[PDB]
Design a protein around this ligand. Sequence first.
Ligand code: IR3
Ligand code: IR3
Ligand code: IR3
Ligand code: IR3
Ligand code: IR3
Ligand code: IR3
Ligand code: IR3
Ligand code: IR3
Ligand code: IR3
Ligand code: IR3
Ligand code: IR3
Ligand code: IR3
Ligand code: IR3
Ligand code: IR3
Ligand code: IR3
Ligand code: IR3
Ligand code: IR3
Ligand code: IR3
Ligand code: IR3
Ligand code: IR3
Lengths: 173, 173, 173, 173
Amino acid sequence: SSQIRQNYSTEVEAAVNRLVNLYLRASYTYLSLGFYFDRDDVALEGVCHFFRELAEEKREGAERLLKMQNQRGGRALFQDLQKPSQDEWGTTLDAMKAAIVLEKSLNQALLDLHALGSAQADPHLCDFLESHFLDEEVKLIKKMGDHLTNIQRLVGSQAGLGEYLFERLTLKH
Amino acid sequence: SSQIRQNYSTEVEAAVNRLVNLYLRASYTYLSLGFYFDRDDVALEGVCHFFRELAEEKREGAERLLKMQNQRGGRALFQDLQKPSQDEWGTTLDAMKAAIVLEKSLNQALLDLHALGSAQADPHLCDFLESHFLDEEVKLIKKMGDHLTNIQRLVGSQAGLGEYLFERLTLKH
Amino acid sequence: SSQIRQNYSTEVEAAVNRLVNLYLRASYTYLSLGFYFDRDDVALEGVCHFFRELAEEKREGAERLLKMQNQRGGRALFQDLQKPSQDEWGTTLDAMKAAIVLEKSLNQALLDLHALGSAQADPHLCDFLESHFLDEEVKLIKKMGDHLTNIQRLVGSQAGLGEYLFERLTLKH
Amino acid sequence: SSQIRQNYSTEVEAAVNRLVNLYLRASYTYLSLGFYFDRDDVALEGVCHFFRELAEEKREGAERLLKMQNQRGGRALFQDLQKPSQDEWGTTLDAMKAAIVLEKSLNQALLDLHALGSAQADPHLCDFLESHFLDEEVKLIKKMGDHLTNIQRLVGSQAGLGEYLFERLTLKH
Ligand SMILES: [Ir+3]
Ligand SMILES: [Ir+3]
Ligand SMILES: [Ir+3]
Ligand SMILES: [Ir+3]
Ligand SMILES: [Ir+3]
Ligand SMILES: [Ir+3]
Ligand SMILES: [Ir+3]
Ligand SMILES: [Ir+3]
Ligand SMILES: [Ir+3]
Ligand SMILES: [Ir+3]
Ligand SMILES: [Ir+3]
Ligand SMILES: [Ir+3]
Ligand SMILES: [Ir+3]
Ligand SMILES: [Ir+3]
Ligand SMILES: [Ir+3]
Ligand SMILES: [Ir+3]
Ligand SMILES: [Ir+3]
Ligand SMILES: [Ir+3]
Ligand SMILES: [Ir+3]
Ligand SMILES: [Ir+3]
């Protein structure tokens, strides 16, 4: 079975499975970003903690999508998870730029799935995305952009000093 | 009067009154289901309690629709409430199947009213349904379907034993 | 850099990165197992919860390995994560058998890495595995085996009844 | 007497006495490092506190070794304690480099004694080192290396500013 599926198209079902893969990929990326900043030759603990908390948030997003797939009577299908795009992530600036690229891509996939649900006249899907993902993405993207601007201002002629100071005074708990 | 009605079509107003009748009918159905399982010759108290709690939930749904009708300046119109479809409800399996049919029908009426509000460019209606009814229906329908599967697994060659066990180990508080 | 690496061979470093991939694969497998038992046509919530808690435990194992890689001055390297071996997991019995196969394979990789560390005269690695992984694996494998025996005893001529009963009376919180 | 000595070689006994001398030497070194940073012409209180806490940790290590020597029935033998290698310790960077050299040397002596105990088939010794010294050393060495990287990043063209800032924002309680 399902004995429950109603108004839930095969197109939406497959798009949700692809979205789950995207979120789990993003979680993996953030795991790699976090452990890079924990290297003794990088050693930016606030930066590590920022990214490790994003890995957890993206995992949680995936899990919420999978719960919804089952609540609608669709079938979760998992694919391989590709490794992150880089093995070494550069400076905090490079990392924050990569993070914003990633979140914009997740946001665009959410918007695409919202448009498909609106084409499929699936209001439960659209509300689901609206309520648990779209505003979260916009808030996160704003925070990233705020961080980017602050990092950029700190580079100066004194890039090491600025990278330290950002980690100490903005990020670090 | 109304001195408040704005962007609220006569089509939506009438559809809301029909939806209220549907919810109150569903409440009535659940009242009958509950008292059937309280018969001394049926005597499945967890089953009775499951359905009596659904009768209350459907009443509450109707009441929320009626409050919204008034908040928009529409006029509540009540119709006769038809008796439930059966006087005797069979086994827990039969009852759970009937309950899922009923909830699918309520869900389809919600979806239909959402489509009408989207055709009428009525976003307050659409949000209302989204926020208080659509996810509730999908959650409930999932729970029912989970129960159905468990009841079906228990029938075995031992149907009385399975019906007892489900009531004792899944339902009963 | 590293300015800290001491007595930490390239062979151990690479084996730790492979072990991280194994644990993250096992976490993924358990995520899939969990959501399968949450399907409305499977609907064994204790079974779902057992596997979702194992997905978290395996993630945590991976994270502990990655922390240790950095504490030793090695470099975390991530690879693609292959999808689980099955899309549908059968009965609780099938799933529990698959889980024991998986844990035996993780255990064997731990034993292999312990032997390499003992060949490389790396006592910190050996203690690390001993203290955080080996006994955890043996405890878990014992619990699985206990569950397997109980499921097997319950199959009887009444397999649905037994699967229900195990989930209700052993697993379900 | 001893009336208790069992499986405890004269080679291990002497190596433990040498290790005690190493730890007490390291404690002395850290005492000197601490009081240097308390000079009014150096005046880095977080730096002083970091090193004074390490002097206590190394004393405690020595004391744990001496307790174990007695628990095994060996005889503690003390030798003269050589003065630290420098009277003046330079900048925080110089000091942190000296500290990592020292800890690497303690770690190597631990590893050497572990290898001797494994050659002597002395598992209580090996467990002792494993449980109370090896991971402590690896954790400490990681922390030092993290500090070194942060100090190095702060030197910039502005070495005084960076030394202040590190002491204020990383070390100082
Ligand atoms: Ir929408
Ligand atoms: Ir949702
Ligand atoms: Ir935090
Ligand atoms: Ir935190
Ligand atoms: Ir809508
Ligand atoms: Ir409302
Ligand atoms: Ir219970
Ligand atoms: Ir209740
Ligand atoms: Ir109750
Ligand atoms: Ir009870
Ligand atoms: Ir070992
Ligand atoms: Ir460890
Ligand atoms: Ir639990
Ligand atoms: Ir739980
Ligand atoms: Ir050993
Ligand atoms: Ir000991
Ligand atoms: Ir702080
Ligand atoms: Ir302190
Ligand atoms: Ir203190
Ligand atoms: Ir302060």
